Amino acid sequence: TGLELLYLGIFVAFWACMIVVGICYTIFDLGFRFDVAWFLTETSPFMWSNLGIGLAISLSVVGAAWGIYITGSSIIGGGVKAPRIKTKNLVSIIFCEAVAIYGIIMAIVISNMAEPFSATDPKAIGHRNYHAGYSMFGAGLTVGLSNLFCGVCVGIVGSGAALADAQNPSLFVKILIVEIFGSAIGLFGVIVAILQTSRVKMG
Amino acid sequence: LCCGPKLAACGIVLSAWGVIMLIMLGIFFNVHSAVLIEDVPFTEKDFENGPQNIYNLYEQVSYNCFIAAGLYLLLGGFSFCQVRLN
């Protein structure tokens, strides 16, 4: 757990620093320097929107790959003695890959909402552009993380179903239902993302 | 210079591919096709008076392509001679 120790140390140090910094800012009457408005406003909307698109695609692909290998290891381990699995259980893999597809689609649906400003002053950038950036980032986060969790869940269920299939053929048909449920979450994320960027308009 | 027939087959197929595709590329360059404009090694000065300089550069690249086609013809001949040897 050496790497876990490093991560825990970094996390604890960062958050102890944050606690002490917040205490110092609040107590020394220097709260006006902790402009969260300035951070959210000066930071370009392009950063938020492009991070949103990149996450929408990359986290979806990460979940798809996670599920694909989680279920493919089990498929190819079980198929050594029951090769029929390789034929029937590809559906599990399909579901995992489906996740990634949603990703790209949402990426497109988000990438179509981008447009330059020709402005730098926050009053000039405006509520419309700032909300467009924030909502593209939020939709990217929603789709990417929902797809990540859905892909991992479908992969776990598919590995379970492949291990069950290796011992009784008549079980996969009844375990796929779980995968279907596990797939729905992905769709939900997409829907929410589509609702978040429905009225988004940069320019 | 005897060699394995597999290598001779690969050499002759590559020679045929090179000859055909590089002859076609030379013909298309010599026709001054705009699709290949990005491959022409022109400079800023070439945009001074007219397109004749770019035409000359197209012809030069076509000559390079034909030279490559001839070299691949020689390579294919060598491979065919080796095949006849085997």
Binding site: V36, A37, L40, T41, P122, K123, I125, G126, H127, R128, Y130, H131, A132, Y134, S135, F137, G138, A139, L141, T142, L145, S146, F149, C150, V152, C153, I156, V157, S159, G160, A161, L163, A164, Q167, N168, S170, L171, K174, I175, I177, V178, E179, F181, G182, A184, I185, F188, G189, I191, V192, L195, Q196, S198, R199 | -
Partner: protein
């Protein structure tokens, strides 16, 4: 007018409502499914009944979706900071309550499914416990609604 950055917290509220509820539902479904698949080899006739926990986990996702939709429909580029904070709170509440309920449903469903594989009489008991976990997510939804509509 209102601040330029006001919509940020509402956006994050919707994102949290969906993301954390999806995390909870995904964990519940994964744990329940990996318990159900492993049971089925021993007790193949129980799968359908044992699908009940998965459904419960799925419901958690729905809750998130519901609240997310609300926050994604009541969120304009010029909402007051107060409404944006309300939507952020509703989203965090529903998302993290759904996360906790999904973890509880996964654990309880896996354990109860295996026990039912070993003890049919446990089935009803499992359902009760699952409901007690499922209600947790419902609680979050309630609070989320109260915050998002206000």
């Amino acid at each position: 007018n209102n601040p330029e950055y006001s919509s940020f917290f509402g956006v994050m509220g919707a994102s949290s409502a969906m993301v954390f509820s999806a995390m909870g539902a995904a964990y519940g479904t994964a744990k329940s499914g990996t318990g159900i698949a492993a049971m089925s080899v021993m007790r193949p006739e129980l799968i359908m009944k044992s699908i009940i926990p998965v459904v419960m986990a799925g419901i958690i996702a729905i809750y998130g979706l519901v609240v997310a939709v609300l926050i994604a429909n009541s969120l304009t580029d010029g909402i007051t900071l107060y409404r944006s904070f309300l939507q952020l709170g509703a989203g965090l509440s529903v998302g993290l309550s759904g996360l906790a309920a999904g973890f509880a449903i996964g654990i309880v469903g896996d354990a109860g499914v295996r026990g039912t594989a070993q003890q049919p009489r446990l089935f009803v008991g499992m359902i009760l416990i699952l409901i007690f976990a499922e209600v947790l997510g419902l609680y979050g939804l309630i609070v989320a609604l109260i915050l998002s509509t206000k």
